[PDB]
Amino acid sequence: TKRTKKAGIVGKYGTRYGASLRKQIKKMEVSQHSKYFCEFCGKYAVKRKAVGIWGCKDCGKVKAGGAYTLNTASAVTVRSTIRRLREQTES
Amino acid sequence: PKQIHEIKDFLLTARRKDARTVKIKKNKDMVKFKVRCSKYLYTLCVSDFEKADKLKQSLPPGLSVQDL
Amino acid sequence: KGRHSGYGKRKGTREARLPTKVLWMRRLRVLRRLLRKYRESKKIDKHMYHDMYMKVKGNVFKNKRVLMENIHKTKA
Amino acid sequence: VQRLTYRKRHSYATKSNQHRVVKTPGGKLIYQTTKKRANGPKCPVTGKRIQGIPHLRPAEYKRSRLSRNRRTVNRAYGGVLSGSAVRERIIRAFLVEEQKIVKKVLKIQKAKEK
Amino acid sequence: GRVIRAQRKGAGSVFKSHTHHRKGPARFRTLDFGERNGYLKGVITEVIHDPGRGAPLARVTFRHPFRYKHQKELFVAAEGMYTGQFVYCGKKATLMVGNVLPLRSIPEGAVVCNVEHKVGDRGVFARCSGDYAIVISHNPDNGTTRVKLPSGAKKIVPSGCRAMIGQVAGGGRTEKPMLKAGNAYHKYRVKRNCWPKVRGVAMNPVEHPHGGGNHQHIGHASTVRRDAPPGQKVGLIAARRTGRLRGQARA
RNA sequence: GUAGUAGCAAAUAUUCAAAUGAGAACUUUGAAGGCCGAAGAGGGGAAAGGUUCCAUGUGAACGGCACUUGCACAUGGGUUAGUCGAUCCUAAGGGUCGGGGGAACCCCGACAGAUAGCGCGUCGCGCGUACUCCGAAAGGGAAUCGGGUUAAAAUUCCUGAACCGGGACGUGGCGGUUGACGGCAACGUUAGGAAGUCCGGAGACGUCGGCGGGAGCCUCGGGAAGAGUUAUCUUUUCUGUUUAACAGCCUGCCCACCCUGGAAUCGGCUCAGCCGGAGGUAGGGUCCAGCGGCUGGAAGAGCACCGCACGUGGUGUCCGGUGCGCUCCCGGCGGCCCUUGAAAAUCCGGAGGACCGAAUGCCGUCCACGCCCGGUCGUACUCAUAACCGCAUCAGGUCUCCAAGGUGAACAGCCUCUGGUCGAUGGAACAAUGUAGGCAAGGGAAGUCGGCAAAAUGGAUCCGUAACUUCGGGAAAAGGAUUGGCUCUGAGGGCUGG
RNA sequence: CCAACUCAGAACUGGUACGGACAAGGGGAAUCCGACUGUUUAAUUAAAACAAAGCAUUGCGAUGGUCCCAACGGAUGUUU
């Protein structure tokens, strides 16, 4: 059954800390505890070991990523920015 | 303590120069031949009583044989 | 024989006296054991074993008897 | 029931003060200190155990106390790398060396272009 | 009066950094001939957590240039680094995330981290999680480079200074609310003895300029001048302004 | 003077007989009645104490009554280690050279510097990053186990059986295709080259939760041995019924790994997960744990019981079951972190192959056996309602290990067994006032600053549960019903047999 | 063939007694203060006081900010 209408994973905090802080922390609470796709082996077996560290259970590849997500938004932009600069220099 | 499984092996260790003594322990179902060497006490178990008497008189002279 | 077991002789909760988890674990091990032996004896195939395996985990069958009856009914 | 006491002057339940209860031929219970669990050899990266070697305290591996066959594996990098890891290195060494030969030859054909 | 809390920190004692479980200083290789002229290949062996440091660290193994032995290094991990990756350091290293290049070889607009201030100092700028520096322009005549630091300040550095391509991994850490005094306790337990903080207005006059009074209140401007002596310099030090930063001020 | 006055009152409790003595409510023995009730008033240890330990004796004093008594006094006796510790290693840190400061006492502390030396040959070559220091009787760490023994000591003494670290050579074995052999493989076998240099691992690590395994304990039945009860009942109740280090062999948990093979009608699988063309299921293997099994040790011991003498002999020590049980250990998985949870000594393995023998006798050998050696200091006892601190034999304070049966959710409370103990100065009365514990007609907070105090409620099962709310709660809301004994009924399992 | 103890129901029965000792929430409608858990005047005050997460402001890019030091130097700093 549906055990909580909206609280979800932040139900472990009971009635403490205020709704906004529970709502705010829910995004990162879900993301840091979720499985992520491993580009190396192709499995959804990447989980956070510590803040910024993401290891694949299957192939054993350990990757440095975001604090609470494997890939941050700025990380994608940096890769494309660096790629564009490399092409011009390597032209 | 180590256990000797072959009567032939027991005789070889009984002739060692460090074999201080041999003791005969007669249980209700077998006879145990125990020879005291420098490092280990070697024990041989002989279930057949008659077969044990033959070994008893085949020990080298000069070795202290005792009956327990 | 069942003496001294009424409500006036109980101090702990039903869970404290016997955890629900213990009862659930007993049932699954009994039912999963029963399914394996039927598959080994070829009374059921792997396709039916898998279907029954997930229904046992889903709390469909409450004891050994009802599981056996369902298998017989399903095979007919 | 019989209750026990430490047989040494160590009075605190530290990891090195672990014990087992043994019943002696005299009919009494007594403690005997038990050594801590040891990991045994493990692979440098994956961390999986190296097969064929028992798990003992470091001093128990001393050559005088352990037979040679129990602390070795008959293979290159035996006791240090698993069989899979050794296989990976051998193939990598051969293939990488072959690729170097291809690179060397490939640049000779272009060098003469003039 | 007595020595205030701010003054007691300089003596060390119970205010020293908690560094028992730290893995060591994270820094580039020592500048040598290989990095000045060509490139040297390294391999990432593991990405580890350093207590008290948000950013993860990367252990890299290098082949020693002239000795028969391995050369171990500890780098601040860039976002995207992974174990088994090849890392190239030197003047001729390609422009890829994780490589360490001199600023002279890095084009304008690139994102870099752990930027050296002095050639060979092994990295001092943009080392915290999620932080980076942006190369602005090059000055071939002076042999210097302009970079934008995380604080938004522009700085001149010699073009020989090295920098790692990419941003520091672990970004977004501070967005998550702590929610609990205990979480703050664990955060600062591995940093130093700075938490919790008692407000000066809650103290007595003997131990803080803000102390005392039949009501809790500062009683004088909390903005103190730059040249105030230790023990008097509390509050907003040399504040150019105060109050909510609205408009262009918060730029 | 006060004054033979205040006062001796917490921790349930003593009684009878006899012995001893000048003298006994207080010493000792026996019997009875109670208590601690395994988070103990039991059995140890770390600090701290320092002879308080043991025997004998005792004029006084002291033990807030008394004493024949003793933690008092007097005399004498008592602490045995290659294996238990210290010792060794490093931690936070401490103490320092040089250098820099300083009138100097001193300050900083490897930071201003020709380090310490090490390795291999036989004095030479090679290497060489400024501490060979102190810092743990709970961190790391070479090796000892039963049985017995004293008035007082023991993993230290005795006997037996092992192990560790060194030293030296001998015999045999092993290798020479100079440096073994077997397996497709995982790997196996007891031996089975090697220097500088280089590399990895062990040592080595948080916390919580669920499962699984091992040991000890608890518990049930049968066999035999002794004991208790017996007017009646009781094939009954109680006590026990033992097996050390170490050595060999076997077993092969949970995982990991290997070979064959090639999977959708997807399957396998946990309590929970989860796993598979990056090769599942299946079939057959390898390895790892053990506080697992067998044998040796080892019945010759220990224990119980029955005799004979006043040391000595005999009999037995057997066969099963059970588990959300308890304590400890281990395995594997999962949860948690803006927290990721020591170091070094030491040990093992590996990469490389300089150099080296024999034409077969030398060389090599981490194999088996034999031979020799083992420093110094601590070790008694208390560990506390009397051996530590609190001026004391002070109801206070002081770290930790072992932990039975019944009731019950329960190391709750209450009762019991092992062990301990009746140690708190006694006797006679039963006024007031008091302290502690209770009860009370009718009324029900009128008492009082105030429901202070006390009373009422209380476990479990079923039913039912509002406002408000940050949607998580509120909630055990509120409200109501049930509960013993006895005799039954139903439901929920395991292992074998095609 | 061998099993352990959880649940449910029924009859009978006692002076309606039965969580029989032990054990073990009183409950409700509101106001003030502090969000909460935490901490505090050892030996008269445990609280509305302190702390707290959250929020905001200030200084500082190392030839630096803050601080210690008689001097030399040092803490923050294994930091950015």
Ligand SMILES: [K+]
């Ligand atoms: K092996």
Ligand SMILES: [K+]
């Ligand atoms: K002052």
Ligand SMILES: [K+]
């Ligand atoms: K603090």
Ligand SMILES: [K+]
């Ligand atoms: K504050």
Ligand SMILES: [K+]
């Ligand atoms: K003030």
Ligand SMILES: [K+]
């Ligand atoms: K002590």
Ligand SMILES: [K+]
């Ligand atoms: K010693």
Ligand SMILES: [K+]
């Ligand atoms: K130690």
Ligand SMILES: [K+]
């Ligand atoms: K440790």
Ligand SMILES: [K+]
């Ligand atoms: K002994």
Ligand SMILES: [K+]
């Ligand atoms: K042992």
Ligand SMILES: [K+]
């Ligand atoms: K002793």
Ligand SMILES: [K+]
């Ligand atoms: K006391």
Ligand SMILES: [K+]
């Ligand atoms: K009275």
Ligand SMILES: [K+]
């Ligand atoms: K009233």
Ligand SMILES: [K+]
């Ligand atoms: K609390």
